Amino acid sequence: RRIDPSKLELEERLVTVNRVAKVVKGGRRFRFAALVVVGDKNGHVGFGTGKAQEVPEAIRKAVEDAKKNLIEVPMVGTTIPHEIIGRFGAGNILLKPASEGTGVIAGGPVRAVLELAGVADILSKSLGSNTPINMIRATLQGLSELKRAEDVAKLRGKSVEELLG
Amino acid sequence: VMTDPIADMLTRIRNANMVRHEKLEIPASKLKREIAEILKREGFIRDVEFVEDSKQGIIRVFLKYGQNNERVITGLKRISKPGLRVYAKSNEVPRVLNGLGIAIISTSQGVLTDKEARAKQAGGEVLAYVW
Amino acid sequence: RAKRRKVCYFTSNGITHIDYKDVDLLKKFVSERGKILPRRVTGTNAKYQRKLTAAIKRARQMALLPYVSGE
RNA sequence: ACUUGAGUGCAGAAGAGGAGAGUGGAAUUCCACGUGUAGCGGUGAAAUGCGUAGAGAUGUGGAGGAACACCAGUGGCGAAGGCGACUCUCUGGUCUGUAACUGACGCUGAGGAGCGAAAGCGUGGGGAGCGAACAGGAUUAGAUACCCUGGUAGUCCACGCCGUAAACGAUGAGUGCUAAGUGUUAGGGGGUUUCCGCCCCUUAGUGCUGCAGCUAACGCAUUAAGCACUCCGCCUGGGGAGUACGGUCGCAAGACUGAAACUCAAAGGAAUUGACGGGGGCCCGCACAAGCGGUGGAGCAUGUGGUUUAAUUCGAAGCAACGCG
């Protein structure tokens, strides 16, 4: 919580539009499946999609998936608060905090997700699974678990800006 | 049993740290004592009140984590393994977390914190690490 | 509810017998055709069925209760 | 220094924990004799086999071996394999309870030592049932199998070697913590209760149902595959291959250890969709059953195959090609 409304300009990058076929009586009923993640360009970057009959249909159900969910990703100016090895679903992600002009060095689903979700310098090299859905899953859990310093002082009551460096 | 005491306390604050319990027990020792004053003074738990008695023990701390899931004890890790010991020099005393957490290196003048131990500028046995 | 019919059958007025000198409760224990009684239909406890079964055997060894019966 | 750990004590409880000796029945076989006749037996159906030399059945008695029905139950005990009639001797271990003492004396532990089902192996006993190899008959096109009738070794015992198993919970041991319910033995404290009995608290052990958490999914879940610590062992794609060669042990049978050259981009775990089934369940239709009348037999009509031709035009070939275009 809270579920952020679709109230901004979405990026709508496509992660990958995979084939799929249910092996039924008569061959294989082929249906496209695409998990393409929409991005707000400020921090609302959510990545889920569905299936449909045509390639544009998978674009439509994917965009409906982007209007489903969104994440926060609090990070003070080309970084995250604590560079935590965040992966959930058998596919890791090792995203550290990088400097200002160190670029968004990430992979396929990491470079799509962080590349369309407001990243400036966050070094990322995975360790684990390589499915698309597993990449957006563990990357979404890792981006949805990294803590912000002001709120981290505001919820653990020691002092705000008492942990600096 | 009794492989390591500090790992028993850290497993206590961890398992109770996810259980959502109000108070937490412990085995009362000088590491639970000085680590209770350090980890209580840094503002994770509400209060440690070491209710001592015969024969040994026994500390009793309360989880100072409010409504928001995961309070000031948000995750702990054995940075020093009793069995294969960590080490950290002056310049190599690593501050765990980066900006959120804090590590507790057992310095040569008392069980310090991360930033205070870097303030003394002398490291020692990496006592525990609270990410 | 909430118990068994024929409540424990030996725990009310036992215990620790018999075995050889007893032929009475042994008379009420060893079944009609000749077999030992079922421990669900008779209704003894754990230790009660254990002691009455051991004393049923050890009282069947000295020819007290029959080692076989009629039909 | 101290006491919860761990140990001793004190008192309880419990068990197919073990080793040796002895005893008891039910049942099968065999034998002796009575009684009696023409079948007994086995199968899907039969046959081999047994029976007029008197079988089966039934009555009585005797001999011998092996296993102990009922209690008996996802009960108990053990380190595991495993352990069952009953009694005795000798013996190990577990849990409960206060709490007298000791004061960390503990956990794991490569080597090393020891045990380890069943098959086997050596010797000497024992051979009632069962029973590889073997014999006969059956079923099949074939039956070195399934089935049946027989039948050696073995199973049994004591003394020695063998040291493998899906030796399984496919989960190493120890310790601490973390929702709950419901069983079930072995105890304890208690609330009133002489009783009894209900209920709570408590251990220890074990089964189910499930929160958090773990996971690839199934699933595990206070007996974790959760959460952390100690230590040992194992794993690095498949075939080649647990094969070769070398060592150790073995009476052997083999056990342990244990490669490589070449070759391939797959093997593999879980889950899904469909298919299949001589798997089960439910149902329907000239499908079967129930009746009618046919075809395949005869001459003839048409089409196809084939053979011929200078050509026997092309197309259809399971129902759905053949009185088809």
From Swiss-Prot, chain A:
Domain of life: Bacteria
InterPro entries according to UniProt: Ribosomal_Su5_D2-typ_SF, Ribosomal_uS5, Ribosomal_uS5_bac-type, Ribosomal_uS5_C, Ribosomal_uS5_N, Ribosomal_uS5_N_CS, Ribsml_uS5_D2-typ_fold_subgr
Keyword Ribosomal protein found: yes
Any one GO molecular-function label of the UniProt entry: structural constituent of ribosome
One BP annotation, GO: response to antibiotic
Cellular component terms per the entry's GO annotation: cytosolic small ribosomal subunit
Pfam families: Ribosomal_S5, Ribosomal_S5_C
Occurrences of domain S5 DRBM (ranges): 10-73
UniProt keyword annotation of Flavoprotein present: no
Cystine bridges: none
UniProtKB keywords: Antibiotic resistance, Ribonucleoprotein, Ribosomal protein, RNA-binding, rRNA-binding
Cross-referenced NCBIfam families: rpsE_bact
Role according to the record: With S4 and S12 plays an important role in translational accuracy; many suppressors of streptomycin-dependent mutants of protein S12 are found in this protein, some but not all of which decrease translational accuracy (ram, ribosomal ambiguity mutations).
Family listed: Belongs to the universal ribosomal protein uS5 family.
Subunit structure, interactors included: Part of the 30S ribosomal subunit. Contacts proteins S4 and S8.
Entry comment, domain topic: The N-terminal domain interacts with the head of the 30S subunit; the C-terminal domain interacts with the body and contacts protein S4. The interaction surface between S4 and S5 is involved in control of translational fidelity.
More about this protein: Altered S5 proteins have been identified in a number of mutants. Some mutations in S5 have been shown to increase translational error frequencies.
Name of protein: Small ribosomal subunit protein uS5
Organism: Bacillus subtilis (strain 168)
Lineage: Bacteria, Bacillati, Bacillota, Bacilli, Bacillales
Curated annotation (Swiss-Prot), chain B:
PANTHER family (alphabetical): 40S RIBOSOMAL PROTEIN S15A (PTHR11758)
The entry's keywords: Ribonucleoprotein, Ribosomal protein, RNA-binding, rRNA-binding
Gene from which this protein is expressed: rpsH
Molecular functions (GO terms): rRNA binding; structural constituent of ribosome
Keyword RNA-binding applies: yes
Role summary: One of the primary rRNA binding proteins, it binds directly to 16S rRNA central domain where it helps coordinate assembly of the platform of the 30S subunit.
Protein name: Small ribosomal subunit protein uS8
GO CC terms: cytosolic small ribosomal subunit
Organism per entry: Bacillus subtilis (strain 168)
Similarity comment: family membership: Belongs to the universal ribosomal protein uS8 family.
Quaternary structure note: Part of the 30S ribosomal subunit. Contacts proteins S5 and S12.
InterPro entries the record matches: Ribosomal_uS8 (IPR000630), Ribosomal_uS8_CS (IPR047863), Ribosomal_uS8_sf (IPR035987)
Superkingdom of origin organism: Bacteria
Transmembrane segments: none
Biological process according to GO: translation
UniProtKB/Swiss-Prot annotation, chain C:
Annotated TM spans: none
Record's note on what induces expression: Strongly expressed during exponential growth, decreases 2-4-fold in stationary phase, part of the rpsF-ssbA-rpsR operon. The operon is induced by DNA damage by mitomycin C.
Pfam family, one: Ribosomal_S18
GO terms (BP aspect): translation
Function: Binds as a heterodimer with protein bS6 to the central domain of the 16S rRNA, where it helps stabilize the platform of the 30S subunit.
Quaternary structure and interacting proteins, as annotated: Part of the 30S ribosomal subunit. Forms a tight heterodimer with protein bS6.
UniProt protein name: Small ribosomal subunit protein bS18
